[PDB]
Design an enzyme around this catalytic site. Structure first.
Site, short mmCIF file in Angstrom:
data_model
loop_
_atom_site.label_atom_id
_atom_site.label_comp_id
_atom_site.label_asym_id
_atom_site.label_seq_id
_atom_site.Cartn_x
_atom_site.Cartn_y
_atom_site.Cartn_z
N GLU B 16 -27.23 5.59 29.59
CA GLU B 16 -28.23 4.77 30.25
C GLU B 16 -27.48 3.96 31.32
O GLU B 16 -26.52 3.29 30.99
CB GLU B 16 -28.95 3.85 29.26
CG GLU B 16 -30.19 3.13 29.77
CD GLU B 16 -29.99 2.08 30.86
OE1 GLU B 16 -30.73 2.00 31.84
OE2 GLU B 16 -28.86 1.50 30.78
N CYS B 63 -33.85 -2.68 28.11
CA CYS B 63 -33.52 -1.28 27.93
C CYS B 63 -34.63 -0.48 27.25
O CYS B 63 -35.18 -0.96 26.26
CB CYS B 63 -32.24 -1.21 27.10
SG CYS B 63 -31.63 0.52 26.99
N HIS B 70 -34.48 -5.12 21.63
CA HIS B 70 -34.47 -6.46 22.24
C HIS B 70 -35.72 -7.29 21.93
O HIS B 70 -35.66 -8.52 21.84
CB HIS B 70 -34.23 -6.35 23.76
CG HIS B 70 -32.88 -5.90 24.13
ND1 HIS B 70 -31.81 -6.79 24.19
CD2 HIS B 70 -32.39 -4.67 24.42
CE1 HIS B 70 -30.76 -6.07 24.52
NE2 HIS B 70 -31.05 -4.77 24.68
N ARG B 461 -26.23 0.82 19.13
CA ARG B 461 -24.90 0.69 19.75
C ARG B 461 -24.13 -0.51 19.25
O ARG B 461 -23.02 -0.71 19.72
CB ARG B 461 -25.03 0.68 21.29
CG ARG B 461 -25.59 1.97 21.84
CD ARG B 461 -26.20 1.84 23.27
NE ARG B 461 -26.80 3.16 23.56
CZ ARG B 461 -27.95 3.60 23.08
NH1 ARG B 461 -28.73 2.81 22.34
NH2 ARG B 461 -28.32 4.83 23.38
N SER B 484 -23.25 -3.04 24.25
CA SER B 484 -22.46 -2.43 25.34
C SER B 484 -21.71 -3.50 26.14
O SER B 484 -20.73 -3.11 26.79
CB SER B 484 -23.35 -1.58 26.21
OG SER B 484 -23.81 -0.40 25.61
N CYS B 528 -24.73 1.79 27.40
CA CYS B 528 -26.06 1.43 27.89
C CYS B 528 -25.83 0.29 28.87
O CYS B 528 -25.57 -0.82 28.44
CB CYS B 528 -26.90 1.02 26.69
SG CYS B 528 -28.64 1.07 27.03
N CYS B 531 -28.50 -2.52 29.20
CA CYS B 531 -28.19 -3.40 28.08
C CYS B 531 -27.01 -4.29 28.38
O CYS B 531 -27.02 -5.52 28.18
CB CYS B 531 -27.81 -2.58 26.81
SG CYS B 531 -29.32 -2.29 25.82
#
Ligand code: SF4
Ligand code: SF4
Ligand code: F3S
Ligand code: MG
Lengths: 267, 534
Positions: B16, B63, B70, B461, B484, B528, B531
Site C-alpha cells: 500500500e 488506510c 483505525h 502489520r 508501518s 503500508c 498508514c
C-alpha cells in the site's frame, strides 16, 4: 502490457488510502479476475503489478503512449501545495504525473471522493493543498467522470466502464459530473427507515430501544437526506450498508463532506 | 559478476502507498539502505479542533487495506478518554470483525502482494498439469486434478498469447531470473491459487460487512459500543459463520500449504532480513482496559532475548523527526506529539521520509506478525506454539530460522491460522452470551471537557496506537503511531537504522536491474505507507 484486443486501463494512485483499489477487488459478477483477464487490460496498477521501480515506470510509459489508446482510472486527490511536493512517485510530483498523463487518455474516470472532490486530505485546513482531478487539471481541459464515495460502490465503476466501452461515450452526468444512473437518487429516498422519518420516529441514542427497533437515524446525524448514492439499492459486499448496520450515513459521496457533514452525529 | 553502486526502487509496487527504497550495493550485497515514504496527507493536522466522535471516520481513511483497524483504534481511544466500558457484545462484535480483517488481509498479502516475488507465472505455462496436481494433492487434504490445473493453464495461455500481459508487464521473472527457483508445476499451483484467492477474498471481506455494514471502510462502531442490532440475529450470525468457515478452509488447505512449499524451495531466505527488537500490543480483549486480558498479550523484546520479555510501557514511545521532513529534531511522546511538515527533498539536511521514526526506550522495533507470534510463543501461548512448532518441523528448520525474511513470511501464515481458529472460539462465546439474554451492544457515556486517552490495536502489520488530548471537549491533539511507522520509518536522532533498513543489510542482489531480493525483504514486512505517514 497491451496492444489490440482488450481495452487498456492505466490506474493511478495519488493522495489516497488504497480503499478505492480494494473496493475494485470486491467486484462481483463480474469478479476481478474476469475484469482483468477478459474485459480489460490492466496495464499499470501499483498495488498489484509485478514490476517495480524502473520496470514499473517503463510499463506506465509503454501504456500511456500506446497507439491503441488507454482509459485512465485515478484514485486519490492531487496535492498541489508547495509545487506538488507532498506527493511524489518515482520522484515526480503527482501533479506533474497527472498533468502529463491524463490529457493523453481517451477517457478519465476519477474513482472515489478523493479523486473526484479532493477528499479526506482536502479537509480543513488542507495542509497539502489537495484537489480533485477536475479542479486540479481544469486548465488542461481534463473532465473526468466522477464516481464518488469513500470508497464508491465498485458496481458503479464497472457499470461506467462497461457503458463507455459499449457506447463509446460517457453516460448522462449530473452537475458534479457523476453518472445519473447511480447517483440520481438520495440515499434517504431509498432508505427502509423512511417511514419512521416521515412519522418523526427517531432513535435518540444508539443504546435506545428505538435504535434497537430500527427507527430513523436522522437525530443521530444521518446525512442520507443530502447525499446522492445507490447504497440502499445495491448494498455493499452483496449484503449490507451503513443504515442497515444501525449507523448514520456520513455523506461520503458528496463534495467537501468532511467539512460539510460534520459533526457527523448532529443534524 | 557482482554489482557495486546504488539501486533505487521507486515505486516499490505491491505494497500500500508510496515508498522509495534506496540501497548501496558493494560486491553484490547491500551494505546500506534508506526507507523513503513520499506521500504526506496530514490527518493529524486536519483533526485538530474537531469533535472527538468524528475522529474514527477520518482516521479510518488512513488506510483502506487495513480498513477498520483505525476506526477501531480511534474508537478504543475515545472510549478510553471518556471512561466508558463497552458492553460484552460490542467487544465480541468488534473482535470478530477484526479477526475477519486479519484473514482477508494476510491472504491478499501472501498471494496478491508478495507471491510475484517468488512465483514465475509465465513458467506455469510449461508445467505438466498432471504432475502439478499430484504435488498439489500431496500438500493439502484438498485434492486437485490435472484437469483443474489445466483449466488455469489454458486461461493463462490465452492471456499471455494476447501479448497484453497487464499486471505481469516487465515482471522481474520474465525471460528467467537467477533468484527465481520454482519448478513449472509449483508455479502453476501457486498461480492457480493466486487466481482462486481473488475470488475467495471477496468472501473474506464480505464477512466484515455482515456486522460491519461494508468493506472497505466499516460503519458500525460508535463511542460506547456498536450500532448493529442486526448482528444479534441468528441469520446474520449464520451468514458470518459460513463465510468464516470457508475462509478458514482456504487458509488451512490452500494458503498455509502453499506458504510451506514456497518456503521450502527458498530456504536460503532464512539467512536474510533479520531484525533485533520486537514490540507487540496484544489483541482480542476480554477487558478493554487490560491489555493482558487479550488472546495475544503485549510485550517488548530487545536483541532477540525472548527469555526476558519486558512489559510494554506506553510512556516509553517517542517519535523522532531528525531524519524526517518535519520541523527540528525533537522526538515526542504522542500525547505531546507534533506534526509540523517541513520538506527538504531527498537527503536534504539528512532527511528522507514523511514517516516519523518511533523508538521504544530509544530502540528501533519490528512490529507485526513476527513480533506477535514470537512474543506469544515465548509467553507460552499454546495455539501459537502448536502451529509454529509444526511449521518448523515441516520445514526442517530450527527456531533461529524465524529471524529472517522467510521467518517473517511464515509468521504471517502462522498468525493467520491461529486467528482463523480463534474466530470460531469468539463466535461461540458471542453466541453463548446472547443465549444468556444479553442483547446490549452500546453503553451510554459523557464527553469530558479535558481528558487524555489511548487506544491500542494489534493490526495485521502490528502495534497500532491512537492518542487523544481532549481540550474544551474538542480534539486538542490527535496522534497516530502506526505499525508501518515503527517498521518502515527512517533513522532516529541516534542514527539507528529502522527495522526495514537494517534488515536489508546483507541482501544479495543477483541482477541490479531486477532487484527482486530487495522486494522479498521489503514485502515481508507488508508495508503500508498511507498508514505509516497519515
Ligand atoms: S475516496 Fe476514501 S476510500 Fe477512496 S482513496 Fe479516498 S480516503 Fe480512501
Ligand atoms: S436513517 Fe437516514 S437515510 Fe434512512 S430515513 Fe432516516 S435520515 Fe433518511
Ligand atoms: S456514508 Fe457513504 S457508503 Fe453510502 S450510506 Fe452514506 S453514501
Ligand atoms: Mg503520527
Amino acid at each position: 502490457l497491451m496492444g489490440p484486443r482488450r481495452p487498456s486501463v492505466v490506474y493511478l494512485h495519488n493522495a489516497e488510502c488504497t480503499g478505492c483499489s480494494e473496493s475494485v477487488l470486491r467486484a462481483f459478477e463480474p469478479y476481478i479476475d474476469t475484469l482483468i483477464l477478459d474485459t480489460l487490460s490492466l496495464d499499470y496498477h501499483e498495488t498489484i503489478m509485478a514490476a517495480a521501480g524502473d520496470a514499473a515506470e517503463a510499463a506506465l510509459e509503454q501504456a500511456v503512449n500506446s497507439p491503441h489508446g488507454f482509459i485512465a482510472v485515478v484514485e486519490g486527490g492531487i496535492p498541489t501545495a508547495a509545487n506538488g511536493i507532498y506527493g511524489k512517485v518515482a520522484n515526480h510530483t503527482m501533479l506533474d504525473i497527472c498533468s502529463r498523463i491524463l490529457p493523453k487518455a481517451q477517457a478519465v474516470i476519477a474513482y472515489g471522493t478523493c479523486a473526484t472532490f479532493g477528499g479526506v486530505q482536502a479537509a480543513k485546513p488542507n495542509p497539502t493543498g489537495a484537489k480533485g482531478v477536475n479542479d486540479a487539471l481544469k486548465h488542461l481541459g481534463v473532465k473526468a467522470i466522477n464516481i464518488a464515495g469513500c470508497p464508491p460502490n465498485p458496481y458503479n465503476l464497472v457499470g461506467t466502464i462497461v457503458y463507455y466501452l459499449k457506447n463509446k461515450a460517457a453516460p448522462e452526468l449530473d452537475s458534479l459530473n457523476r453518472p445519473t444512473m447511480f447517483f440520481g437518487q438520495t440515499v434517504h429516498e431509498q432508505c427502509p427507515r423512511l417511514p419512521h422519518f416521515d412519522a418523526g420516529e427517531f432513535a435518540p441514542s444508539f443504546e435506545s430501544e428505538e435504535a434497537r427497533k430500527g427507527w430513523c437515524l436522522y437525530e443521530l446525524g444521518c446525512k442520507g437526506p443530502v447525499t446522492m448514492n445507490n447504497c440502499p439499492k445495491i448494498k455493499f459486499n452483496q449484503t449490507n450498508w451503513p443504515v442497515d448496520a444501525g449507523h448514520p450515513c456520513i455523506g461520503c459521496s458528496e463534495p467537501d463532506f468532511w467539512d460539510a457533514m460534520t459533526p457527523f452525529y448532529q443534524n | 559478476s557482482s554489482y557495486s553502486g546504488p539501486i533505487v526502487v521507486d515505486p516499490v509496487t505491491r505494497i500500500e502507498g508510496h515508498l522509495r527504497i534506496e540501497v548501496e550495493v558493494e560486491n553484490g550485497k547491500v551494505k546500506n539502505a534508506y526507507s523513503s515514504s513520499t506521500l504526506f496527507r496530514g490527518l493529524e493536522i486536519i483533526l485538530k479542533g474537531r469533535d472527538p466522535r468524528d475522529a474514527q471516520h477520518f482516521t479510518q481513511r488512513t488506510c483502506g487495506v487495513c480498513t477498520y483497524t483505525h476506526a477501531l483504534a480511534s474508537t478504543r481511544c475515545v472510549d478510553n478518554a471518556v471512561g466508558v466500558h463497552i458492553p460484552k457484545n460490542a467487544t465480541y462484535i468488534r473482535n470478530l470483525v477484526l479477526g475477519a480483517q486479519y484473514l482477508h488481509d494476510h491472504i491478499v498479502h501472501f498471494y496478491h502482494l508478495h507471491a510475484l516475488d517468488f512465483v514465475d507465472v509465465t513458467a506455469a505455462l510449461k508445467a505438466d498439469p498432471a504432475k502439478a496436481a499430484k504435488v498439489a494433492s500431496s500438500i493439502s487434504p484438498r485434492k486437485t486434478t490435472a484437469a483443474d490445473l489445466k483449466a488455469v493453464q489454458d486461461k493463462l495461455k490465452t492471456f499471455v498469447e494476447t501479448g497484453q500481459l497487464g499486471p505481469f508487464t516487465n515482471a522481474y521473472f520474465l525471460g528467467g531470473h537467477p533468484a527465481y527457483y520454482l519448478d513449472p508445476e509449483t508455479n502453476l499451483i501457486a498461480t492457480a491459487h493466486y487466481l482462486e484467492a481473488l475470488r475467495l477474498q471477496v468472501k473474506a471481506a464480505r464477512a466484515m460487512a455482515v456486522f460491519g455494514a461494508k468493506n472497505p471502510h466499516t460503519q458500525f462502531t460508535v463511542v460506547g459500543g456498536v450500532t448493529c442490532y442486526d448482528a444479534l440475529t441468528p441469520q446474520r450470525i449464520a451468514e458470518f459463520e459460513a463465510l468464516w468457515k470457508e475462509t478458514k478452509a482456504f487458509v488451512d488447505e490452500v494458503y498455509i500449504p502453499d506458504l510451506l512449499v514456497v518456503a521450502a524451495a527458498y530456504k536460503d531466505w532464512t539467512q536474510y532480513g533479520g531484525t533485533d527488537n520486537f514490540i507487540t500490543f496484544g489483541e482480542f480483549p476480554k477487558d478493554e482496559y487490560d491489555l493482558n486480558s487479550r488472546f495475544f498479550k503485549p510485550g517488548v523484546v530487545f536483541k532477540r532475548d525472548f527469555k526476558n520479555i519486558k512489559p510494554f510501557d506506553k510512556m516509553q514511545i517517542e517519535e523522532h523527526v531528525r531524519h524526517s521532513w518535519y520541523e527540528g529534531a525533537e522526538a515526542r511522546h504522542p500525547w505531546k506529539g507534533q506534526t509540523q511538515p517541513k520538506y527538504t527533498d531527498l537527503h536534504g539536511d539528512d532527511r528522507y521520509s514523511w514517516m516519523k521514526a518511533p523508538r521504544y526506550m530509544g530502540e528501533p522495533m519490528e512490529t507485526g506478525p513476527l513480533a506477535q507470534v514470537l512474543i506469544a510463543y515465548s509467553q507460552g501461548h499454546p495455539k501459537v506454539k502448536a502451529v509454529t512448532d509444526a511449521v518448523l518441523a515441516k520445514l526442517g528448520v530450527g527456531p533461529e530460522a524465524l529471524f529472517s525474511t522467510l521467518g517473517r513470511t511464515a509468521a504471517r501464515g502462522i498468525e493467520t491460522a491461529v486467528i482463523a481458529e480463534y474466530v470460531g472460539v469468539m463466535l461461540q462465546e458471542y453466541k453463548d452470551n446472547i443465549a444468556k439474554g444479553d442483547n446490549v451492544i452500546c453503553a451510554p457515556w459523557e464527553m469530558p471537557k479535558q481528558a487524555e486517552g489511548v487506544g491500542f490495536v494489534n493490526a495485521p502489520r502490528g502495534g497500532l496506537s491512537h492518542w487523544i488530548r481532549i481540550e474544551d471537549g474538542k480534539i486538542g491533539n490527535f496522534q497516530l503511531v502506526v505499525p508501518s511507522t515503527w517498521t518502515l520509518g527512517p533513522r532516529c536522532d541516534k542514527n539507528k537504522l529502522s527495522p526495514v533498513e537494517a534488515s536489508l543489510i546483507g541482501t544479495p542482489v543477483a541482477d541490479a536491474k531486477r532487484p527482486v531480493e530487495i522486494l522479498r525483504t521489503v514485502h515481508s514486512f507488508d508495508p503500508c505507507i498511507a498508514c505509516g505517514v497519515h
